[PDB]
A paper describes a structure:
Using electron cryo-microscopy (cryo-EM) and single particle analysis, we determined the organization of the tail proximal extremity of siphophage T5 that possesses a long flexible tail and solved the structure of its tail terminator protein p142 (TrP142).
T5 tails, purified from a capsid defective mutant, were produced, vitrified for cryo-EM characterization, and imaged for the data collection on a high-end electron microscope. The estimated resolution of this map is 3.9 Å, which allowed us to build pseudo-atomic models for both TrPp142 hexamer and a TTPpb6 trimer. The interaction between the hexameric TrPp142 ring and the trimeric TTPpb6 ring under it is ensured by the tip of loop 63–67, which inserts in two similar pockets resulting in the domain duplication of TTPpb6 (14) and is mostly mediated by electrostatic interactions. However, TTPpb6 also exhibits a C3/pseudo-C6 symmetry as it results in domain duplication (excluding its Ig-like domain); thus, the two consecutive TrPp142 monomers are almost superimposable (rmsd = 1.02 Å over 156 residues). The unsharpened cryo-EM map of the T5 tail proximal extremity shows a 25 Å diameter large, cylindrical, and ill-defined density filling the tail tube lumen to the top of TrPp142, which disappears from the map after interaction with FhuA. In the lumen of the tail tube before interaction with the receptor, densities of much lower resolution are present, which we attribute to TMPpb2.
Residue numbers in the entry:
A (entry chain A), C (entry chain C): 1 to 159
B (entry chain B): 1 to 156
D (entry chain G): 1 to 464
E (entry chain H): 1 to 310
Amino acid sequence: MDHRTSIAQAMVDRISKQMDGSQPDEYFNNLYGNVSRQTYKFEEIREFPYVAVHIGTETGQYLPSGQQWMFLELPILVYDKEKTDIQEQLEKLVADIKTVIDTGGNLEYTVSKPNGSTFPCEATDMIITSVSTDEGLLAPYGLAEINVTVRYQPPRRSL
Amino acid sequence: MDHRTSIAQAMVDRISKQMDGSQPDEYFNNLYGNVSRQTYKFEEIREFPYVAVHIGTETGQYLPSGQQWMFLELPILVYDKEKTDIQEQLEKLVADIKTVIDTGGNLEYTVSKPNGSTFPCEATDMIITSVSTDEGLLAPYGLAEINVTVRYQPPR
Amino acid sequence: MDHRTSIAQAMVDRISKQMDGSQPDEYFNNLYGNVSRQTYKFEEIREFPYVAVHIGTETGQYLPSGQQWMFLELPILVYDKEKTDIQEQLEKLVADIKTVIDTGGNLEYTVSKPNGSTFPCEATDMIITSVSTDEGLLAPYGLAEINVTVRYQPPRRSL
Amino acid sequence: MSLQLLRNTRIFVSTVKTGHNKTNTQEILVQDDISWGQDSNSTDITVNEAGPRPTRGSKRFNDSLNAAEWSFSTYILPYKDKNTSKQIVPDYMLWHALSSGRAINLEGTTGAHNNATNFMVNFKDNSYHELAMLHIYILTDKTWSYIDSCQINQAEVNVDIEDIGRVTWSGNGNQLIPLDEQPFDPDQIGIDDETYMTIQGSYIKNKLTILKIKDMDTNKSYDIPITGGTFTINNNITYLTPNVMSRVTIPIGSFTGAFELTGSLTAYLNDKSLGSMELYKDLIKTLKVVNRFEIALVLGGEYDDERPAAILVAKQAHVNIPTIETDDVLGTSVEFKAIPSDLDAGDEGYLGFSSKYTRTTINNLIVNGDGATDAVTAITVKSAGNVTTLNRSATLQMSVEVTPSSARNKEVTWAITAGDAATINATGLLRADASKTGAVTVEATAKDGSGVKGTKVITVTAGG
Amino acid sequence: MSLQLLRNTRIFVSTVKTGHNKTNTQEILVQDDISWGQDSNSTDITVNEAGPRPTRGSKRFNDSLNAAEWSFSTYILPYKDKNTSKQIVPDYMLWHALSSGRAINLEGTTGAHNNATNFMVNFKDNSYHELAMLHIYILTDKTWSYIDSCQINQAEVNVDIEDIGRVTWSGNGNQLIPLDEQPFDPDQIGIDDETYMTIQGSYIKNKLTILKIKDMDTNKSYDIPITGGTFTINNNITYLTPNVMSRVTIPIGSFTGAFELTGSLTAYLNDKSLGSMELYKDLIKTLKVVNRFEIALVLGGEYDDERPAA
């Protein structure tokens, strides 16, 4: 029982959905849905601002009554150009993504059982470890790595 | 609601405002506002003394009532030439930066909002955890590192 | 509020002052004031025995009443030639420097306020971490790195 | 040949010993903090005399057997059951046993009873010598064992721990009896995958925890941001055991002690108005013998979105003298105990559990006791015929509009606060008299304790 | 809206409550081991009867209030004052309070009297029911609070800790009263940068610490090199509080106990003559009921050069 890519797809869809002009007083930017679950290379990326959602290691734990706490890391990377300056635009994007990640309810995704039914579910909690900007990169191209651990629980097994 | 660049701009603005000719007794030199958090190539550095504010990693921990503790690390670099004696000049700059960081009130930074609601907020902690300088560089050129790890609680 | 270079200059002046022939029964060697606060390179040095006083990092600690315990490292390096042997001469120099560092009072340095007044001051204490000889160097040229942390306190600030 | 692992331990709770089904037995999910057992006493005799070559020896004897002890921690999981569409929690039998001694009845108004909006446990109707009688069945790998009959002694909820909310249960029992045969099919009684999927998303996060606190005597509301705290329900269970010497004994009956809804709080020191400084200064300066505080610790916070939340309410709770601490950032600690109005009334406090809590629902639970029942949020007065002025010796029976329109307390009290120009009664027929050349202010208070006011000043003069 | 940090806390000690100046109020420098507060008692009543459906409930009551408590550590800083050129220490008011109950008088011969050479504290003239009455004023960032009246109960000096010499004060008080307005200008009363610069170099290091020990009956002196030790002055203070039941009470008066200048030492066993072996063997062999030893712990060591020492 794993929900890695499902959680990542839910994260991408949530970021895309809660960034349009419907909430100008809640969020700064507007990605127009330029959120993808994978990036080939930074050289391949053609549009800015652009955000990629990576998949990290996936730790598991065990509980006496058959439960299983299972942690997943979600390193999120963003890119932007020097329309005005790297610092202000990158900070705006990072704070806006933080507002997306901290407000609202839980991460809702779709779990597809092998039988042929997709049951919507909800993740437990979201916590950010650290945010970092990659200085020393190209002069007009920036980076702001924000590290996140989505903690979810699979359907009960190991009976 | 991170305001890390806001904190860096508050650092730069406070450094530019203080350590000027208005209070020549409490400070050694005059930068003439030669402060900018935006870094440049070392060969591109126009005149000395020059100060650059680097923003590094930024950790955080949570609290039960929606409170958030966010530790921002702000490495600071000062470059200056051996006009008279390079070791003494960097000494003076480091002492002045320490005085600016320690004395006075807490940091004043302006937090902006999407609907143009800009209001001022202040941080709590200002500690220079360590100070180190690099030697073996080009004889006229110098560099010193001052590590401030500003600790701030973001609004809400 | 920093006194790196002032402390290093005071250390150099103390070493140069307390090694002449005035105290033959207290000290072995005599550098004739061949003590400098910086060395460009080992190959540049022309006279032996020669001692350089490097400047290390600067740790800082804060106290409730506005005080500030703030530390400084003083790696001291010495050089000598094979007049008799590396071991005995380097040991004599290191033991001499240790006797200088452990006896007497404190470090008296000169602190120059921006107004134009230089008030003599005194450092708090001195502790040796370790002394090390750099074996494997050139056959007639030796080295003996002695590490020192000078602990001192700046004028009261951070009110 | 097989070794029993803790990772494969399942604890089942039942209110009966035979004829098990899904309505009397239920599986609950525990954490690594699981313990059980039963320790024994032992008397030892020895001789002593002054003769040479003494008799060095002893003979141990078992005399009695202490009551068994068990303890485990479970997450708080308020969810909705598709069978009845009523909010329940997996460990509701434990809540009922800790709250009341009568038989389990989820549709009532006492004990642990659920509503279509929230599952709330009422500590009223707890005046019994023994609580609900549960038998704890423990499955570990393959061997079956159980505790004969348990009465929960304590329940701890802690918000200082950064993980999701947990409740720490602790009780006692008569005897830990090992079992030789399986009492019931584990899968049929235990929770299915559907319930696990439905409750997997109803965890309560302690990262988002608020508190409402208010002194009744001074009518001051405080904004304290919590950094930690806890509240513990204690029944003070004391066991009884015959002490006959010939044979080993077993405890027979348990006597309840004193109900204790004790809790504690801590927060940073914030100079802002009505902050922790205001509470600290008021409590220390006033130095009253007893206080009447209305604390409300809300796990999961209150948001306009429908989100799960666990609520503790402690009406008229006593608050001790705050003690200031000293560390990197100054913080104070407030400890409170929820005393009742009357020693036998049993209105010390009540809890609330739901998955679709809202700000309005939480507020009407705080001021009404239940989530479903509404509560007045604003009140304005209106005169009979919309007249804002009056003369001497005139009758104006004003009325009041209530908000929201579904509030249960549609009646209020009529009072006069400022000015002496007219008098009113409970009915509302306001009348004035002669020699009145001044205005008066009429005020009202909701009978449900919400505390909403409707203000109006009528310019009563000598007339035309 | 502001949060109070411990890093910005300043402790002021004064012997009066009004008309403050620089001769009655003085600022002292504390360490991270700072604590204060005032805990409260509580009586709890309950009922018990054998009837069915018993009355389960209780009602807490406050009955009295314990005496306040505070404790902080400060460095030993003997320096000279340019006003009078007499040796003093920043925390001399605390020494006077711990040593005597009479009024403060630096030019006398009892209590805490200083000289042109040294500042000495004499425990003679301490036979009083209460010591000097001080009010501790605590500033934390922007909020002012203070303890009504404190009497120093203990002082510990530890040489085992490798850092420079420190004294650990500890006392009690009548009540911890929060304050609404600033009593005095903090900078005028507090120490200036000149005094800080003058005393920054007068620290006492425990790396150099010697001891003189001698038995008067035998007239034999021992060369004992210390590896650790401490001495503690304790006044054994005890507070009196009425126990009226109707209203919450406050302690009114304190009674001094028994003066106790207890200390301890430790050293390696050295076979050298008149070493620790001689002391060990003599003390074990004689097994006298009471000994008359003249110990002298000298923090900072003694040298021909003019160097600070306690």
